[PDB]
Amino acid sequence: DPTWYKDAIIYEVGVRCFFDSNNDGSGDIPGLTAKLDYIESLGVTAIWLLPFYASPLKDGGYDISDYRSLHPDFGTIEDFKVFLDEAHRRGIRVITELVLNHTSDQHQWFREARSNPNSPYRDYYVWSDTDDKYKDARIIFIDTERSNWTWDQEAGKYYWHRFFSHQPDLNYDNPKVQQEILDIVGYWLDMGVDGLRLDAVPYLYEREGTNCENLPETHEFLKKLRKFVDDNWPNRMLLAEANQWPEDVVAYFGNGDECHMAYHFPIMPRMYMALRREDRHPITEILRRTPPIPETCQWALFLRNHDELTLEMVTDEERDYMYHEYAKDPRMRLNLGIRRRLAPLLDNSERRIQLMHLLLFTLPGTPIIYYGDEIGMGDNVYLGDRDGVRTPMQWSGDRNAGFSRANPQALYLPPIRDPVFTYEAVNVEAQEQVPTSLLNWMKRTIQIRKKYPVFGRGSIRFLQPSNRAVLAYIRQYQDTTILCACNLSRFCQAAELDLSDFKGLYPVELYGKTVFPQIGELPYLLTFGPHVFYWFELKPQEQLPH
Ligand SMILES: [Mg+2]
Ligand SMILES: [Mg+2]
Ligand SMILES: [Mg+2]
Ligand SMILES: [Mg+2]
Numbered sequence: 001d002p003t004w005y006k007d008a009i010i011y012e013v014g015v016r017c018f019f020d021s022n023n024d025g026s027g028d029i030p031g032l033t034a035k036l037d038y039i040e041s042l043g044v045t046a047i048w049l050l051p052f053y054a055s056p057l058k059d060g061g062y063d064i065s066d067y068r069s070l071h072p073d074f075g076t077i078e079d080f081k082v083f084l085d086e087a088h089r090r091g092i093r094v095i096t097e098l099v100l101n102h103t104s105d106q107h108q109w110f111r112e113a114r115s116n117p118n119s120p121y122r123d124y125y126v127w128s129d130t131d132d133k134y135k136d137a138r139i140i141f142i143d144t145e146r147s148n149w150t151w152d153q154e155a156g157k158y159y160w161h162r163f164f165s166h167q168p169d170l171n172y173d174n175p176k177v178q179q180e181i182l183d184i185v186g187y188w189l190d191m192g193v194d195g196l197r198l199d200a201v202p203y204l205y206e207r208e209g210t211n212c213e214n215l216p217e218t219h220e221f222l223k224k225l226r227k228f229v230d231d232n233w234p235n236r237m238l239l240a241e242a243n244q245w246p247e248d249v250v251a252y253f254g255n256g257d258e259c260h261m262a263y264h265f266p267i268m269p270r271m272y273m274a275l276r277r278e279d280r281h282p283i284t285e286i287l288r289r290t291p292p293i294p295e296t297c298q299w300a301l302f303l304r305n306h307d308e309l310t311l312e313m314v315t316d317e318e319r320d321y322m323y324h325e326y327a328k329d330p331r332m333r334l335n336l337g338i339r340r341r342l343a344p345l346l347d348n349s350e351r352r353i354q355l356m357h358l359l360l361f362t363l364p365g366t367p368i369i370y371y372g373d374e375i376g377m378g379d380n381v382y383l384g385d386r387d388g389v390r391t392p393m394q395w396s397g398d399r400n401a402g403f404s405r406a407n408p409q410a411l412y413l414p415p416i417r418d419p420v421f422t423y424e425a426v427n428v429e430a431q432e433q434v435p436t437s438l439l440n441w442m443k444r445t446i447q448i449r450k451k452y453p454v455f456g457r458g459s460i461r462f463l464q465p466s467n468r469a470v471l472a473y474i475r476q477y478q479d480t481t482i483l484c485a486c487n488l489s490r491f492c493q494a495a496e497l498d499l500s501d502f503k504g505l506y507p508v509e510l511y512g513k514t515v516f517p518q519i520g521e522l523p524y525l526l527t528f529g530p531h532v533f534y535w536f537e538l539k540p541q542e543q544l545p546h
Helices: 029-034 036-042 077-089 108-113 175-190 216-232 246-253 267-277 281-288 316-326 350-362 428-432 438-450
Strands: 010-013 046-049 066-070 093-098 149-152 157-160 195-198 237-240 261-263 298-302 366-370 459-462 470-477 480-487 493-497 506-509 524-528 533-539
Touching: 010 036, 029 036, 029 077, 036 438, 046 195, 066 077, 066 175, 077 093, 093 175, 175 195, 175 216, 216 237, 216 246, 246 261, 267 281, 267 316, 267 350, 350 438, 350 480, 350 533, 428 438, 470 493, 470 524, 480 493, 480 524
Parallel strands: 010 046, 010 366, 046 093, 093 195, 195 237, 237 261, 261 298, 298 366
Antiparallel strands: 149 157, 459 470, 470 480, 480 533, 493 524, 506 533
């Protein structure tokens, strides 16, 4: 009930990308509502909607010019309320974006503030007569921005932006700014939205002689926001986009008094390294270096999202390794990251795609599926910024991949057309028809996961077999004990597990409930095909099947 987010399966979808219901070339909210059968049939329990508010769309809607209105291409407030009730009617929660940190430079606030130094809005933003303030803050969009200050001629001052120059940061030293945020929060939670994603949350406050990240004042505002939300809407959820090193990420949980969830940005790049190295150490090492979190808090697990695969919070040598291994074409790189989709990153290997999803589904947290990864969609690194991982959902082999009946040249972005990942080979309609497709494998795997709340809520203990290609761990919650063991190598592997804490129990494999040999006191030999992942419930004799 209050910890509902711990059991969710989250689907990350952009309204503009999913389904065009009126055939103008752009996805929309009524189109999203018409596809809820597919979303429900996948097994997801919560939809995280990328920004859908008024925006010039120069950063995919994260440059908002009016927090209270939908963008015209996506529909009306009333379309959204129809969506919100329809999803709730199916037991599907909804999570929306709170772009706390900055607005479009076309927001009215900034258009007033830049005009007259005496407007009530002048201090809504962060102004400076010199562009050497905040010397120690890095530039995030290093491929586009020369500086976090740009000159505004109408204002006679520089203004601050952590992201693109058309996204001026809000000023959290202005108590009115903070009040505008809380009112945006109330405006949307009032409609019944279940969760808010706190975008770019480490960058709220700036301070001189400081890197302007993770400042105590920022954490202070979030404790206030948490208390504000808890006092007026029960059982909501705040989700922190904090891509920092593990110690700094865990602080966004405060002590139960800050953010309910945070993305597990530390683990995400190490999964790709472990797989490529065929060695579990990157995964187990980064988790050893990740402090524990408050009891009611939850990690959000993900493999990919609407952004590049970020390499900001990995070491320099790890970044180079990841570049050389996963981004050999330099067009695949963007800022400190890799602008590629999951299936291309994994060379369209079905066994690797399944392995990575099983890891996503069996580590401690709440898994996010990025729209279209459940059919193995590809990318288009020629599209520009991160557009190449945001192409329309691939419903069929028809014109426009069934996303629209519009003139194909009017689509907001073209579907994937490369010879391996073309929508003529990768589409929902094709995969629905074969029981072994990636989509049906995902449906079945999610269905099993939902019978086992241990995965969202239980503890974890890692094993240490001497075969370094094998990653094995125990999940426990209440009366349920799970053994997960998988092979990170593209070759067959053998490993021996010390399961002596569970002598006398039987590993029962969750896919077909097949009974493996009883755990004795001797080490337990498992044997793996390439990239094979096993999950077993350890069960006593009186609970074996058949
Ligand atoms: Mg449309
Ligand atoms: Mg800021
Ligand atoms: Mg180890
Ligand atoms: Mg393989």
